[PDB]
Amino acid sequence: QVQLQESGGGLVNLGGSMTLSCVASGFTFNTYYMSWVRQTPEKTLELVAAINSDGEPIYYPDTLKGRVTISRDNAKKTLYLQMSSLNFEDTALYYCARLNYAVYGMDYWGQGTTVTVSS
């Protein structure tokens, strides 16, 4: 079975940084495009970043531009997300989601890792 396990969430002070990991299993990680989607308290979903199987970012929202980095370690079958200068609005459930060629969208999603921005 396709599995995605995110980790690295927790408490971060206002202006701090976060580094999330998403370890993949049950599929050939290296051939799939990947994404990070966060879910706010309101249950709203928003795409944070997407990366090709080659390790090249293919999407960042103009707003997170400059404080976000999506990376992958194909050999460790791991996807990463780096965010800096966290603000109150960065508090969310962060999901890693696999991209499906036939869907032209997300198919599987991890369980999410929570980032709580604090003062």
Added chain:
Amino acid sequence: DIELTQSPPSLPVSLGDQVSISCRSSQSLVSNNRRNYLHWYLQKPGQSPKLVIYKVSNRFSGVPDRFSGSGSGTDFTLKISRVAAEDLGLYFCSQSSHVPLTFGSGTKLEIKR
């Protein structure tokens, strides 16, 4: 970006009900080469979002015959013909026709009073 307005925001149901929920796109999904790339996810309570249907009408792997999708352009519908407890949760439509990929306002399927 493309706003996906889901109606109703909340839908109280009884098990065995047949329901239809709506997803209205702020812009046409037939304006380019990627025609109606409109998908549906179910976020069951305490679980991760699961793909139900993609590209309007295609049932993802494991999705029962009770689920179906329709629409073209801007108005899309997800229909559930006999709601089971396993169908309750938050339904989000999503579009990948236009950049960036966006998610709908959601429809919470919940047991009626």
